[PDB]
Design a binder for this molecule. Structure first.
Ligand SMILES: Nc1ncnc2c1ncn2[C@@H]1O[C@H](COP(=O)(O)OP(=O)(O)OP(=O)(O)O)[C@@H](O)[C@H]1O
Ligand SMILES: Nc1ncnc2c1ncn2[C@@H]1O[C@H](COP(=O)(O)OP(=O)(O)OP(=O)(O)O)[C@@H](O)[C@H]1O
Ligand SMILES: [Mg+2]
Ligand SMILES: [Mg+2]
Ligand SMILES: [Mg+2]
Lengths: 73, 73
């Protein structure tokens, strides 16, 4: 359950081989992540500062728990 | 005319004080740029290498000449 990467449209927009494994093209860890229970304003600040769109939210061990984005609102 | 930066949707997406100048909310030089007459596949390779949707095409002096984007490809 520990995070090892992330994949988005910018990571695979023009990739030719659809057989490419996730580990081959994913954005390698470490990444910009927050802890469980992180405040919404802190998440917005991280999103604006790092200009990443999908911010993962991690537990106190390294296993992913959630993802923060205002689009649900 | 010296290309000193670039401002895209992400920089200005969630800014509140819209009265701020561009230089305060722009990505400053040096940018990821290519020479005039750069090959299409070379430009695509650079775009995927930096995973950025804008590529300024500049003269050797650094004067802006053109704007390649990822959605054209
Ligand atoms: N939280 C993060 N920390 C670090 N890098 C990230 C994070 N989220 C995404 N990235 C990386 O940033 C790059 C762009 O991801 P982003 O989420 O901005 O793309 P997207 O949502 O698909 O955007 P677009 O609509 O422009 O395609 C990719 O290389 C991706 O792996
Ligand atoms: N040539 C470049 N070199 C370096 N950084 C750049 C370059 N062009 C744009 N940037 C910056 O890289 C970031 C991402 O660029 P990109 O063009 O993917 O964003 P965008 O098109 O506004 O994104 P979206 O479509 O997801 O809203 C922005 O902060 C932008 O200012
Ligand atoms: Mg996007
Ligand atoms: Mg765009
Ligand atoms: Mg886009």
């Amino acid at each position: 359950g520990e995070l090892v990467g992330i994949i988005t449209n910018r990571d695979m927009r023009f990739e030719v081989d659809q057989s490419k494994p996730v580990s081959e093209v994913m954005t390698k860890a470490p990444l910009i992540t927050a802890k469980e229970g992180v405040s919404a304003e802190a998440a917005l600040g991280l999103l604006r500062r790092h200009k990443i769109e999908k911010l993962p939210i991690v537990d106190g061990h390294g296993k992913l728990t959630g993802l923060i984005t205002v689009k649900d609102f």
